């Protein structure tokens, strides 16, 4: 998961109370070497009938079907990775029109086309630094929480469109504000230099959400 590590990193950053300082030097916590490679740019929750479909920033698409299987289309528009209930992975292609999986491939195309003609690409202004899939997700009233197979946890806030991309490997957070401006901070440096109340409260909620992910296991 890498989730336990993220919890500890978030516990530590929140413990330092970064917004409760005389002087706050948020800019000094910025680290461009820690910019994420992957994040979810688009998603669609039709899980009550079809499943959850998503797009990653590299333009690859994925669908979590209700039978707990997953299908991903790579950004070459043809290569597929199909993950079964038991975690068995297999390679197929759209162009081969595979007997077994046409119905699921067609559903993915529906998702793909919907996201393409309806939805904004999140973090389109970010240049990034094995392809991950969506391992776990849930929605609250305030946000959607997206746990990727590379350890990343993404949190999209509904009301103001602000977003957090948390990486436990870099021990880093990327924050996208309401004006689509993005920064990448090393968490240990946020402990040292501090941050605004806006980022601080979102990191507090993030910890609750990681606690939730870990407790739902």
């Amino acid at each position: 998961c890498h989730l336990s590590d993220m919890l500890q990193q978030l516990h530590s950053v929140n413990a330092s109370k970064p917004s409760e300082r005389g002087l706050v030097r948020q800019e000094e916590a910025e680290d461009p070497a820690c910019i994420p490679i992957f994040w979810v740019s688009k998603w669609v929750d039709y899980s009550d009938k079809y499943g959850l479909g998503y797009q990653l920033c590299d333009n690859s698409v994925g669908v979590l079907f209700n039978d707990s299987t997953r299908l991903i289309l790579y950004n070459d528009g043809d290569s597929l990775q199909y993950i079964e209930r038991d975690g068995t992975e297999s390679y197929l292609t759209v162009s081969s029109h595979p007997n077994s999986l046409m119905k699921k491939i067609t559903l993915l195309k529906y998702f793909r086309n919907y996201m393409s003609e309806h939805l904004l690409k999140a973090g389109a202004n970010i240049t990034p630094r094995r392809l991950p899939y969506l391992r776990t997700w849930f929605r609250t009233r305030s946000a959607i929480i997206l746990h990727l197979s590379n350890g990343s946890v993404q949190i999209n806030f509904f009301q103001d469109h602000t977003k957090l991309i948390l990486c436990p490997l870099m021990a880093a957070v990327t924050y996208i504000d309401e004006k689509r401006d993005f920064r990448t901070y090393r968490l240990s440096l946020l402990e040292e230099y501090g941050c605004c109340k806006e980022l601080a409260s979102r990191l507090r909620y993030a910890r609750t959400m990681v606690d939730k992910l870990l407790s739902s296991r």
């Binding site: 688009k42 998603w43 929750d45 999140a122 999209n156």
Partner: peptide, 6 residues
């Protein structure tokens, strides 16, 4: 629900 629209 879906992500933010065009």
């Amino acid at each position: 629900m879906q992500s933010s629209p065009l």
